[PDB]
Structures are given as structure tokens and as C-alpha cells.
């Protein structure tokens, strides 16, 4: 996260760290959507141009964390993967369309003050909150700058950007399964997601029921916090049918 701030304790209790077993380092962010399911970006797990292809046994999930590098004894929970599900139309070849994957945990995680699931949007919440200018929140342990790494979880609030501005900011083909967020040069303020923030949540607090909903997943961008460029997020509600099918079929 670039130009963000340190998170408060328990501010993002759905935040998940996907952690490489060997060598032990940060892989990506992710989110807790129930006591046994974690949502992340597909590219975190599979991305053939970079020879990236992780299997279940390659990884651990760390939940309830604040510190990036520390083992937070009596606070974090560390979980094993039962199974990974990648969207079958995930487009790694061209533009990261449908950049989403589910992970099932070997055992349910115990909720606590620091560990708690985020909501997934319904059609009406999505319609009312995914509007240009409305701000969401992105969190993660990734780089603080494009060209280092934070001591604790970072947070930044960013406005959703109009689809024409999103499209005109890049040569990449943008799809209905993505949205972009960030400030304009003219707006002054700045901030962005960056490498290592991948697969973490873009959340918004519904003013209707005061609950936090995950509307996006950190997916891609060109550089980090560049003027005239915007971060791109997987549109969670647009892929919700695949999400429900997986969880229903695989419980």
C-alpha cells in the first residue's frame, strides 16, 4: 500500500496473509468470508508467464495478523489448505479477467476480536455502493513504494472511478468484471495498492445496515500510485454466482 497509514488493531479482521512455507515469505493478501473459506486473486496462485503455480501444500493462511513479519502469538491463527478453486475462465493470457480464487481450510478458524469474516455483496448493495466517487478501503502488507515493506498492516481509502476514465487510463482491455479506484491528478490526494497487496480486499461500509462488504479484490495496475493511472479490482458481485456454486457444491 502506497501513501496509506498503519491500520488500527482489529480494523480489518477479515484480512488474510497467504504465506509461502519455503522460503517463508509473504505471497499475497486475501480475505476471510466464513470460518472455512478464504477469497483471493487467482494470479496469487496461478500465473504462467511468471512460472507461478502454487498447490495447496505449498501454502499457509495466516489470520488475525497486524505485524507483517512477526509471529503474533496468541493472536494470529495459521491454517492449512484443503483445496484451491480458481475461476475456470480466469484470463491470465490477456488481462486478468475474472481474477478470483477460493481456498478451503482444513479446519474451521475460531473467530476472535482479531478474526472475523467480511460480507459479500447482494445485488442491491452492489448497485447502491459501486458508484463513481464513492470510497472503499484497501488493506495489505505489500510495498510502500513502486520503486520498502511495512512493519504493520496498511490501509488507504480510495474513490471508485468512472469506467470511461478507467478505460482511457490504460491500453489494456478492461472488462465488466473489473473496476478501478484512485484519485485523479487534479484531486490532490493520492494512494494505491501495490505488489504484495494482490488478492486483498476492497471494502465498503454499507450506510444501510452498517456492515462491511467486500466489493473488490486487489488485482492489477501499471506501476503503483502513478498520476493518471488507477488500481484495478476484481468485481466481486459480478462473480458471485461462481462463488456460491463453489461453496454450495463443496460446502
Amino acid at each position: 500500500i502506497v501513501e496509506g497509514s498503519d491500520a488500527e488493531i482489529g480494523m480489518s479482521p477479515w484480512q488474510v496473509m497467504l504465506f509461502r512455507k519455503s522460503p517463508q515469505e509473504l505471497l499475497c493478501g486475501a480475505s476471510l468470508i466464513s470460518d472455512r473459506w478464504v477469497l483471493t486473486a487467482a494470479h496469487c496462485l496461478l500465473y504462467p508467464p511468471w512460472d507461478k503455480n502454487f498447490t495447496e501444500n505449498d501454502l499457509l493462511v495466516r489470520i488475525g495478523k497486524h505485524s507483517r513479519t512477526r509471529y503474533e502469538r496468541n493472536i494470529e491463527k495459521i491454517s492449512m489448505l484443503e483445496k484451491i478453486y480458481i475461476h475456470p475462465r480466469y484470463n491470465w493470457r490477456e488481462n486478468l479477467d475474472r481474477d478470483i480464487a477460493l481456498m478451503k481450510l482444513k479446519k474451521p478458524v475460531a473467530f476472535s476480536d482479531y478474526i472475523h469474516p467480511v460480507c459479500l455483496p447482494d445485488r442491491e448493495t452492489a448497485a447502491s455502493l459501486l458508484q463513481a466517487g464513492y470510497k472503499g478501503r484497501v488493506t495489505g502488507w505489500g510495498n510502500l513504494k513502486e520503486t520498502g515493506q511495512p512493519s504493520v498492516l496498511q490501509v488507504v481509502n480510495l474513490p471508485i472511478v468512472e469506467r470511461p476514465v478507467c478505460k482511457d487510463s490504460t491500453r489494456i482491455r478492461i472488462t465488466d468484471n473489473m473496476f478501478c479506484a484512485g484519485y485523479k491528478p487534479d484531486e490532490g490526494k493520492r494512494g494505491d495498492a501495490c505488489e504484495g497487496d494482490s488478492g486483498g480486499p476492497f471494502v465498503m461500509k454499507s450506510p444501510f445496515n452498517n456492515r462491511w462488504y467486500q466489493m473488490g479484490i486487489v488485482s492489477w495496475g501499471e506501476g503503483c500510485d502513478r498520476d493518471g493511472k488507477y488500481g484495478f479490482y476484481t468485481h466481486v458481485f459480478r462473480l458471485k454466482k461462481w462463488i456460491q456454486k463453489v461453496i454450495d457444491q463443496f460446502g
Binding site: 482489529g10 479482521p13 473467530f111 472475523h116 459479500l120 470510497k135 461500509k205 462491511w212
Partner: peptide, 27 residues
Amino acid sequence: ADCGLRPLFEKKSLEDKTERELLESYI
């Protein structure tokens, strides 16, 4: 279910330091 309600904030009626920035953008 109890999703999206944070034990150290919503469940205690405490607000974090910048959630009001989001609220104010919901125009």
C-alpha cells in the same frame, strides 16, 4: 451472518479513525 461487524468497532459502537471519510462519499 454476523459478517462485516467488527468485534472491536461495530460490536462495541466504536468508530475507526477514517470510516467517516467513506460515509461522507456516499452522496
